[PDB]
Amino acid sequence: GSHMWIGVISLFPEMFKAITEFGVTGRAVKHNLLKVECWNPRDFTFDKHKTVDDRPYGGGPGMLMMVQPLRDAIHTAKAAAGEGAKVIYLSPQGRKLDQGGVTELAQNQKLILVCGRYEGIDERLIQTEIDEEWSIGDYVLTGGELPAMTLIDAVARFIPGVLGSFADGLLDCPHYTRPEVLEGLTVPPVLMSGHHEEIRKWRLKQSLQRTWLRRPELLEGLALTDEQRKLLKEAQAEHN
Amino acid sequence: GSHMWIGVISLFPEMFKAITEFGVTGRAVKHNLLKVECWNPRDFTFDKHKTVDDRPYGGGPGMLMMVQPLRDAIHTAKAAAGEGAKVIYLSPQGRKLDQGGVTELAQNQKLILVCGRYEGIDERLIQTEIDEEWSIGDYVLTGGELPAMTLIDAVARFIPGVLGSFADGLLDCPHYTRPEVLEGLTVPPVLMSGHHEEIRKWRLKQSLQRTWLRRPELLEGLALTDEQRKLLKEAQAEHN
Numbered sequence: 411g412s413h414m415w416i417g418v419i420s421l422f423p424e425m426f427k428a429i430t431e432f433g434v435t436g437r438a439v440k441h442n443l444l445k446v447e448c449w450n451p452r453d454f455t456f457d458k459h460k461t462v463d464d465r466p467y468g469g470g471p472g473m474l475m476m477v478q479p480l481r482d483a484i485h486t487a488k489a490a491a492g493e494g495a496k497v498i499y500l501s502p503q504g505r506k507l508d509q510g511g512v513t514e515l516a517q518n519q520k521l522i523l524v525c526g527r528y529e530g531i532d533e534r535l536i537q538t539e540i541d542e543e544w545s546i547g548d549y550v551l552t553g554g555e556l557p558a559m560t561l562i563d564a565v566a567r568f569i570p571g572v573l574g575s576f577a578d579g580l581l582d583c584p585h586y587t588r589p590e591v592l593e594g595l596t597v598p599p600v601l602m603s604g605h606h607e608e609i610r611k612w613r614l615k616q617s618l619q620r621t622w623l624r625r626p627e628l629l630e631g632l633a634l635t636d637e638q639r640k641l642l643k644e645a646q647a648e649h650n
Numbered sequence: 651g652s653h654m655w656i657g658v659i660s661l662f663p664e665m666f667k668a669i670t671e672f673g674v675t676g677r678a679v680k681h682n683l684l685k686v687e688c689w690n691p692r693d694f695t696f697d698k699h700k701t702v703d704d705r706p707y708g709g710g711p712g713m714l715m716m717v718q719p720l721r722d723a724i725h726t727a728k729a730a731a732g733e734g735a736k737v738i739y740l741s742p743q744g745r746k747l748d749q750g751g752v753t754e755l756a757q758n759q760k761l762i763l764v765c766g767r768y769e770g771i772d773e774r775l776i777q778t779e780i781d782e783e784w785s786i787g788d789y790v791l792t793g794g795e796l797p798a799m800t801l802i803d804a805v806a807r808f809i810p811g812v813l814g815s816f817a818d819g820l821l822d823c824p825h826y827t828r829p830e831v832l833e834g835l836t837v838p839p840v841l842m843s844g845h846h847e848e849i850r851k852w853r854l855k856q857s858l859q860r861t862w863l864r865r866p867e868l869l870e871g872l873a874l875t876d877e878q879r880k881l882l883k884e885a886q887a888e889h890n
């Protein structure tokens with residue numbers, strides 16, 4: 411229906427088996443809700459040793475991805491995607507991914523994800539080939555593959571049919587399952603009460619309290635409902 | 651030497667092949683700089699159908715991980731790790747991972763990473779079994795495996811021997827490799843000059859400018875050197 415095609419450019423395409431063969435994303439792939447298609451720059455080399463890296467001008471300790479195989483791999487993915495595919499580069503210099511950003515990217519029916527290795531890719535390729543640069547967080551990894559897979563997994567959840575408290579901007583409430591007592595610790599009685607409205611308000615209150623204690627800046631981004639304002643006040647009063 | 655042991659609790663241990671079999675982390679594993687060891691809660695079930703999920707008290711659409719197999723898997727990993735292993739739970743409610751946080755976690759010789767699935771794990775297990783809760787970013791994924799792999803990859807880079815501009819808190823400068831001209835776009839002459847000190851100052855200036863334009867809040871966290879203050883001022887003047 412609202413299926414998604416994701417093209418991937420990567421020197422290690424077999425890494426993507428982690429999402430295409432397992433769990434909820436693996437089911438999405440098998441049910442044709444999600445298609446992940448990989449192109450390896452190594453297949454676009456012409457020298458005997460299939461060289462995919464190159465030295466940076468100006469010197470420095472690191473290598474970059476070699477332009478010609480990377481560029482040809484990208485052009486080949488773009489031709490397969492046809493019109494309307496947004497090309498994304500994963501890097502620490504990119505726009506910081508968050509849930510609102512995930513819902514934005516989920517609007518695209520087609521994506522091409524370029525996974526950098528070594529010190530990354532030539533700046534002029536970013537200018538000529540990349541539409542948007544994104545980061546999954548403020549840390550450095552050995553490659554863009556885990557960030558690409560993270561992005562795929564996150565947007566996959568918004569494909570209808572893929573799934574069987576972040577939505578209103580709060581951290582999740584605590585959850586409990588069997589047994590009723592675990593190392594002396596009991597389940598909050600309200601969760602046993604069967605009183606659906608009390609349970610809803612307890613969970614909402616807990617989410618508000620948790621967000622306030624752990625991530626108070628997230629509250630500032632919100633326009634709380636009357637009910638949310640009440641429950642948050644009660645929680646802060648009980649904490650005091 | 652300063653090798654690292656990482657125990658992993660996961661319903662999909664084969665996902666970790668993505669880091670243990672490929673690239674720089676795969677080399678780290680083969681060279682015994684990094685050891686990743688997985689325990690699957692499914693192996694700790696006793697019923698015919700090997701059930702690893704359970705219903706949450708209070709109702710709700712989701713499932714949680716079943717306590718008994720998860721708990722037994724964790725205890726088994728802890729016994730293998732011996733003393734000094736810090737147990738980490740990956741979740742959106744956790745401390746936000748950044749590079750300074752990565753360098754903190756990299757101090758541990760032993761880690762145990764618990765990967766949640768479904769709606770996560772019982773709150774009382776977090777209290778009784780988990781030392782620290784971490785998030786790789788403000789978004790929701792289908793499982794804690796990609797966050798665990800992200801964390802492993804990031805800390806792996808600080809293991810001596812694993813590697814062959816974030817360090818001073820700035821975004822990276824632009825990088826260029828062959829060819830000298832790419833779709834009309836030329837390499838900045840300074841990078842061709844062989845003038846090492848000019849090249850260093852150009853790169854530093856670019857990093858400062860890039861950080862200022864894309865991530866100005868990161869600059870506020872820094873105490874800039876005289877040189878950095880000068881180059882940033884020049885860059886802002888040239889932008890104006």
Ligand SMILES: NC(=O)c1ccc(NCc2ccccc2O)nc1
Binds near residue numbers: 502546547550551
């Ligand atoms: N925070 C991130 O989203 C992220 C993305 C990619 C990455 N490493 C590959 C790479 C390294 C350096 C430059 C460009 C690159 O593509 N590490 C972290």
Ligand SMILES: NC(=O)c1ccc(NCc2ccccc2O)nc1
Binds near residue numbers: 741742769788789
């Ligand atoms: N931002 C993160 O680090 C992150 C970690 C785990 C995750 N999903 C598994 C899971 C989902 C919900 C609750 C607990 C859980 O363990 N999604 C994102």
